[PDB]
Design a protein around this nucleic acid. Structure first.
Ligand SMILES: [Mg+2]
Ligand SMILES: [Mg+2]
Ligand SMILES: [Mg+2]
Ligand SMILES: [Zn+2]
Lengths: 196, 52, 161, 205, 190, 134
RNA sequence: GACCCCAGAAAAGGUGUUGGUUGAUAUAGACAGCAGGACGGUGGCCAUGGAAGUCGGAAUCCGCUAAGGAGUGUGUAACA
């Protein structure tokens, strides 16, 4: 079944290149499958996004080099966790809607935190039994209005360091907006052209 | 009152290990064969039991 | 101080979940070290202290007195910081210089206790003598001779009975 | 209550079947010899695997019962109650004897029937399992597990025949198509090209 | 099967000089000098170039057992290069439930005293291997630092401390007290 | 904030249940409904799913308003008492209607597959009314 | 370990090494590592005090897809 699956990918990539003249090469970050489902539903009207093996893409493009020249410019650019998206609408609108639909990704434990988050002093709204997590982080808290109330602002995690499980689950209970990211455009291909 | 970070470190040397079913030898958690000649380097291993 | 904070929080969340609300007939029931409803010390050596006792002697260091000690118990306990060099309190965890500040609870309640605990238990004769004179703790015959843990017991017995 | 099988492991005596001379034989331990879907048609189960013996020795009826249950339990666990058909191809027809020592000594030493064993020759088939073609690893594992209930050395074979028949599997299909074979229950009937023509007329019609 | 030739090469940095006396490798760098003789293994050690400074380990007609001793030497030399440039630093965290473990670093870091391990009056005096210095961190409450040029010496000294604090007659899954190697690193982080 | 955070769900159905379900224990979330609130909750919940009836509520601070999401097994067993291709087709309009689809034909394929609890051959050779749904 | 009778060993094992048989994957990028994702109907049906992928009986489908089993194990009373 692997042989037929690869061939189906080849006819899939080859007919999408023939159909669309304009594409964005885009690098997928640490984005969940739900994020990709949201993107595909967002773009379902106008654009179609395809991702797969980079070595598979390079082979299919090299086979199509003779029939469609000037596609060799994409050959020294399929590097890293990147994929295609096929568009016919204007570049600035496609880019703008792409940079706008970013999901609020939650804090996953053990990962790098590129966004520096700080927790202000406000009533969490959580009952006086989730205080185990607050005491785990040493955050001094008092119970006011029959619910957890943080006394003062606490800095939780800085940029460029690993997050822990206790920090992650505290963010999950607090439901605050942690570091979030989506697919970001590496380059753009407009009928044989390379830009940023 | 050990913090969770230090509980992980001490368990790396005390609890997260494989045990031979033939000679009870304490092996690393990725072992597939016992290292000891008296059991014939058998592959009958079981995880070391936890306290949970 | 963190351990004292954990006990206070654990007690408070117990009475908050199971007991009535703040608007119940009893009213506010939570314990506060700033309120003087929770004390410290050890019963085996016969010495205990409250936030009230320290604020009494620090207002003395500084109706009317009742108000003074009551408002001072707020700055005695909590996440408030005190620079030894400046001599003034602060609500900022970092000084303008950049010096890390100690919290007021450890800086002027636990600090004398740690000084006397270290002094007696490490047999520093001149340090113990100067501390007793400065803190005006009075000792008597058959007690001035002893040294070691019994001397430690007698000192806090007569300092914070 | 029974001697170790090491005392009766080798075919040292002439065959001693239960007959009008050997009387008083207790019933053999194994009474059932086919399990699974015995009623399955021939074309349902094309794969046949055997447990062949390597030693000319005696297998006790108690070992045959233990090994038949052992293979049955694993085949049920992996192929379902209706996914396989097993057939123990040894019957315990030889009677072993015991000389009971509590006239003392070797005087009147001829023994009484103790049990039954089956004498197996080198290359003889002890157990056969037929099943679907995809269950090959389960057949090999079931026969391998049943090997531990037997004394000697046994080999696991995957026969080139179709199921339990005596015809090679690569020729079974077109032999049935050309009417040389007609199924009858779990086996097939070979129809030769000689006989009354009325039987040739019953076929092809 | 005797493989005709199994060879492996290690690249030496510019600021390091490796000198060979037969199968004795002398590695000299900014942090000092390391010496280690591989006379227990029959290999051909040679120095290849001038600007690249390669060290090649050859093994002719070796079977499986002594073909495994080619990468072993190459990794030992790479550890020697690592030691004389960056040095080896093993951080150890002391973990305890009730009784804090008191560690006193004696003369030159050569001696380590563990006083209150599981609250017992016995004093464990562990001596470091020569060339290894132990220290108490100012960045963590309960943390030792074992620094030295030789990975073999430093990690052996760390194992001496760790096996010194071994619980007996109890359930080690429950009583986790002791000193354990937390992270294995270097100095100068370059 | 809708004056309350009451978007919490419920998994009761069939009989009234009231206190015998988890309603009294989950009642202190809003603390207003209690016996009257969860009784009038089941009042409109008796029908529109006699199964587990995974539902959601919005509190009017004294009463409740219930919304019943179209669970596949719920609507299939409630519509049951065969193919009934007409009734499944007309029911794939008012549901949650997303199902990560691209065509409304895919939704009826997925629930025609979920109703297998064989009715898979219809999906196997599906060639009629594919774009009739949208 | 070391020579007919003959003077001591079996089943069963071994990621010790040596040879051999058969099969499978691979520059359309094997394997092993490190690094992301592992979704939606759906907490699928019947089971019950709770069984949400993972106590069990059966089913074993679908869209989205690069891929994701109505689930290989760990874990929770169930969740997580
Ligand atoms: Mg005889
Ligand atoms: Mg290594
Ligand atoms: Mg004991
Ligand atoms: Zn072993």
């Amino acid at each position: 079944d692997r042989a037929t699956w690869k061939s189906n990918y080849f006819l899939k990539i080859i007919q999408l290149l023939d159909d669309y003249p304009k594409c964005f090469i885009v690098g997928a970050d640490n984005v969940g499958s739900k994020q990709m489902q949201q993107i595909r539903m967002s773009l379902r009207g106008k654009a179609v996004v395809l991702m797969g093996k980079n070595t598979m893409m390079r082979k299919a493009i090299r086979g199509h080099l003779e029939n469609n020249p000037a596609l060799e410019k994409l050959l020294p650019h399929i590097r890293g966790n990147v994929g295609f998206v096929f568009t016919k609408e204007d570049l600035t609108e496609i880019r703008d809607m792409l940079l706008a639909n970013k999901v609020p990704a939650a804090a996953r434990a053990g990962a790098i935190a590129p966004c520096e988050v700080t927790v202000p002093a406000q009533n969490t709204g959580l009952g006086p039994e989730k205080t185990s997590f607050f005491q785990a982080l040493g955050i001094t808290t008092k119970i006011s209005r029959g619910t957890i109330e943080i006394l003062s602002d606490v800095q939780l995690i800085k940029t460029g360091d690993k997050v822990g499980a206790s920090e992650a689950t505290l963010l999950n209970m607090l439901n605050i907006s942690p570091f979030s990211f989506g697919l970001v455009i590496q380059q753009v291909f407009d009928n044989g052209s390379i830009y940023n | 009152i050990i913090e969770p970070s230090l509980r992980q470190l001490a368990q790396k040397y005390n609890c997260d290990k494989m045990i031979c079913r033939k000679c009870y030898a304490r092996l690393h958690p990725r072992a597939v064969n016992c290292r000891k000649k008296k059991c014939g380097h058998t592959n009958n291993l079981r995880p070391k039991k936890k306290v949970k | 101080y963190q351990t004292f904070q954990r006990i206070v929080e654990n007690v408070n969340v117990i009475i908050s979940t199971y007991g009535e609300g703040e608007s119940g007939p009893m009213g506010n029931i939570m314990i506060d070290p700033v309120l003087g409803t929770v004390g410290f010390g050890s019963g085996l050596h016969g010495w205990a202290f409250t936030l009230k006792q320290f604020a009494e002697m620090y207002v003395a260091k500084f109706a009317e007195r009742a108000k003074k000690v009551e408002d001072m118990m707020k700055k005695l306990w909590g996440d408030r910081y005190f620079d030894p060099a400046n001599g003034k309190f602060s609500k900022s965890a970092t000084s303008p210089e950049g010096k890390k500040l100690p919290r007021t609870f450890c800086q002027l309640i636990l600090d004398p206790i740690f000084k006397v605990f270290d002094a007696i238990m490490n047999f520093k004769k001149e340090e113990t003598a100067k501390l007793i004179e400065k803190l005006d703790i009075k000792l008597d015959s058959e007690d001035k001779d002893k040294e070691g843990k019994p001397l430690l017991k007698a000192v806090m017995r007569r300092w914070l009975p | 209550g029974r001697r170790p099988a090491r005392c009766y492991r080798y075919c040292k005596n002439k065959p001693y079947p239960k007959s009008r001379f050997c009387r008083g034989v207790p019933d053999a331990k194994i009474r059932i010899f086919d399990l699974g879907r015995k009623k399955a048609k021939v074309d349902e189960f094309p794969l046949g695997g055997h447990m062949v013996s390597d030693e000319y020795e005696q297998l006790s009826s108690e070992a045959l019962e233990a090994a038949r249950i052992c293979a049955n339990k694993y085949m049920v666990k992996s192929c379902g109650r209706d996914g396989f058909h097993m057939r123990v191809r040894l019957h315990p027809f030889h009677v072993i004897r015991i000389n009971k020592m509590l006239q003392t000594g070797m005087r009147g030493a001829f023994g009484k029937p103790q049990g039954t064993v089956a004498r197996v020759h080198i290359g003889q088939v002890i157990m056969s399992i037929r099943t679907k073609l995809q269950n090959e690893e389960h057949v090999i594992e079931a026969l391998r597990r049943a090997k531990f209930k037997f004394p000697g050395r046994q080999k696991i074979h995957i026969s080139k025949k179709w199921g339990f028949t005596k015809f090679n599997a690569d020729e079974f299909e077109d032999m049935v198509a050309k009417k040389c074979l007609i199924p009858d229950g779990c086996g097939v009937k070979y129809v030769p090209s000689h006989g009354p023509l009325d039987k040739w007329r019953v076929l092809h019609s | 099967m005797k493989t005709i030739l199994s060879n492996q090469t290690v690249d030496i940095p510019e600021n390091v000089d490796i000198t060979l006396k037969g199968r004795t490798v002398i590695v000299k760098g900014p942090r000092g000098t390391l010496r280690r003789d591989f006379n227990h293994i029959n290999v051909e050690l040679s120095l290849l170039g001038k600007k690249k400074k390669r060290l090649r380990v050859d093994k002719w007609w070796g079977n499986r057992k002594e073909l495994a001793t080619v990468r072993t030497i190459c990794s030992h030399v790479q550890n020697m290069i690592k030691g004389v440039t960056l040095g080896f630093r093993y951080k150890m965290r002391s973990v305890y439930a009730h009784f804090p473990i008191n560690v006193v670093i004696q003369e030159n870091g050569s001696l380590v005293e563990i006083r209150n391990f599981l609250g017992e009056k016995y004093i464990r005096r562990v001596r470091m291997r020569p060339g290894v210095a132990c220290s108490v961190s100012q960045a963590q409450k309960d943390e030792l630092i074992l620094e030295g040029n030789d990975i073999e010496l430093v990690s052996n000294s760390a194992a001496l401390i760790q096996q010194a604090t071994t619980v007996k007659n109890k359930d080690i899954r429950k009583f986790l007290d002791g000193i354990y190697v937390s992270e294995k690193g270097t100095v100068q982080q370059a | 904030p809708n004056e309350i955070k009451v978007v919490y769900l419920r998994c009761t159905g069939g009989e009234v249940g009231a206190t015998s379900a988890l309603a009294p224990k989950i009642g202190p979330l809003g603390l207003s409904p209690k016996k009257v609130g969860d009784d009038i909750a089941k009042a409109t919940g008796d029908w529109k799913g006699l199964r587990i009836t995974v539902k959601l509520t919005i509190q009017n601070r004294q009463a409740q308003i219930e919304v019943v999401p179209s669970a596949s097994a719920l609507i299939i067993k409630a519509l049951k008492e065969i193919t009934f291709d007409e009734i499944v087709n007309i029911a794939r309009q008012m549901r949650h209607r997303s199902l990560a689809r691209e065509l409304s034909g895919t939704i009826k394929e997925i629930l025609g597959t979920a109703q297998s609890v064989h009715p898979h051959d219809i999906i196997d050779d599906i060639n009629s009314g594919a774009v009739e749904c949208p």
